[PDB]
Amino acid sequence: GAMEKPTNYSQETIASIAQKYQKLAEDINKDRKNNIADQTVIYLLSESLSDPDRVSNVTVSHDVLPNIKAIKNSTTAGLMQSDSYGGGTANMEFQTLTSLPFYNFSSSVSVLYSEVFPKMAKPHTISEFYQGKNRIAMHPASANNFNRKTVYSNLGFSKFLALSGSKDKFKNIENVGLLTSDKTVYNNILSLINPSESQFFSVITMQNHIPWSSDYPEEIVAEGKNFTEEENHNLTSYARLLSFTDKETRAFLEKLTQINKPITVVFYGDHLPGLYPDSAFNKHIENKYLTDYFIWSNGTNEKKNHPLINSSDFTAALFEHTDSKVSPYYALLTEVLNKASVDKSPDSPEVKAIQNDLKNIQYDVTIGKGYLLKHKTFFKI
Numbered sequence: 232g233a234m235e236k237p238t239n240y241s242q243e244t245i246a247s248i249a250q251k252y253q254k255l256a257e258d259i260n261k262d263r264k265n266n267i268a269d270q271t272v273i274y275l276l277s278e279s280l281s282d283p284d285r286v287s288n289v290t291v292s293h294d295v296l297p298n299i300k301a302i303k304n305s306t307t308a309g310l311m312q313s314d315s316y317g318g319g320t321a322n323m324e325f326q327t328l329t330s331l332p333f334y335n336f337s338s339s340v341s342v343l344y345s346e347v348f349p350k351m352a353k354p355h356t357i358s359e360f361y362q363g364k365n366r367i368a369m370h371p372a373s374a375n376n377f378n379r380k381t382v383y384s385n386l387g388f389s390k391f392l393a394l395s396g397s398k399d400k401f402k403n404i405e406n407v408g409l410l411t412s413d414k415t416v417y418n419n420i421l422s423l424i425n426p427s428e429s430q431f432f433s434v435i436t437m438q439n440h441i442p443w444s445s446d447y448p449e450e451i452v453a454e455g456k457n458f459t460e461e462e463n464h465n466l467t468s469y470a471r472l473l474s475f476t477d478k479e480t481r482a483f484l485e486k487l488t489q490i491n492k493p494i495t496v497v498f499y500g501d502h503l504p505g506l507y508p509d510s511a512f513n514k515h516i517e518n519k520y521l522t523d524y525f526i527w528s529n530g531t532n533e534k535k536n537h538p539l540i541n542s543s544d545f546t547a548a549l550f551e552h553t554d555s556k557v558s559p560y561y562a563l564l565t566e567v568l569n570k571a572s573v574d575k576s577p578d579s580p581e582v583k584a585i586q587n588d589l590k591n592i593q594y595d596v597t598i599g600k601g602y603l604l605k606h607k608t609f610f611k612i
């Protein structure tokens with residue numbers, strides 16, 4: 232099955248969890264001034280983006296993420312633990328939207344959008360707080376890859392810009408490398424931002440997807456210890472492509488600062504590019520699964536301390552960064568973010584206690600009994 236049933240799963244356990252997080256949400260909201268629905272929010276999955284400087288045995292002639300590193304220094308930012316290497320985009324994507332961690336589902340599950348999403352009777356996501364007309368998805372490939380068209384349709388999205396398979400198209404398409412440039416994606420976001428509305432964007436880039444082809448900037452060269460010629464060439468091409476993403480990401484944020492609407496971007500790489508041999512990580516194999524993320528608003532930014540989080544934690548972190556009031560569900564997810572996520576020991580009693588709360592909710596809304604249907608305020612702010 233898709234998930235193990237918690238040993239204490241029952242109507243009474245779900246009731247206890249719902250009452251517990253109802254009170255915690257009230258406690259949290261006493262110190263949260265803002266409303267999430269007053270913010271336009273962009274979830275920006277930057278395909279295969281991850282600083283090569285963290286790969287121990289790699290040397291790059293130049294810093295290829297200088298602007299993104301400066302952004303990370305200025306706002307809530309850190310490392311994201313990914314569930315896969317060289318692929319798995321849609322699984323990280325699912326976790327950002329639902330906040331349900333892949334690590335709590337069965338190891339038999341390969342793709343959440345195909346095996347778990349269709350079984351959810353009433354999937355709760357960050358997008359539900361926005362009007363359907365203001366929910367926009369964007370991905371420069373087929374809308375049907377990884378079942379995305381079905382997912383975004385069932386989430387009530389008004390638009391899904393795709394290269395094929397949707398009525399919604401990207402404008403002024405240009406390639407940087409072999410695939411659609413990040414500049415194209417960013418400029419298409421900007422053209423759809425409507426300051427008179429609160430909008431939710433779910434964006435999945437393609438520029439830095441395998442295979443990597445770039446001859447310039449020629450001064451950017453990269454090598455790894457004992458790498459083959461092919462490995463070094465792929466790393467060099469990838470680093471060159473990152474340099475464009477880095478500059479275009481800065482230019483994108485600069486444009487967002489000039490829009491008279493509160494806008495927050497959750498930016499993250501989904502997984503490392505699948506070009507490094509295991510030897511590249513030299514006894515620090517954890518770095519095979521650690522990408523960069525930041526959470527940046529177009530006004531004043533706090534910098535909350537979250538050096539290592541999971542993709543499923545982004546929504547709770549977004550509420551905290553924007554000082555937005557939470558539902559009981561997001562109160563639980565805030566407890567996960569702070570006390571029970573991937574930076575903590577899974578053997579810690581506190582981690583296990585909070586994870587038991589989460590697993591019961593996660594089971595209930597996927598393949599369980601839907602006991603939460605009787606707790607009408609659990610997902611409400």
Ligand SMILES: O=P(O)(O)OC[C@@H](O)CO
Nearest residue numbers: 317318319320321372376
């Ligand atoms: O990185 P992967 O898992 O191949 O995902 C690519 C997919 O988003 C293309 O439509």
Ligand SMILES: [Ca+2]
Nearest residue numbers: 262263264554
């Ligand atoms: Ca506050």
Ligand SMILES: [Mn+2]
Nearest residue numbers: 279318320501
């Ligand atoms: Mn990917």
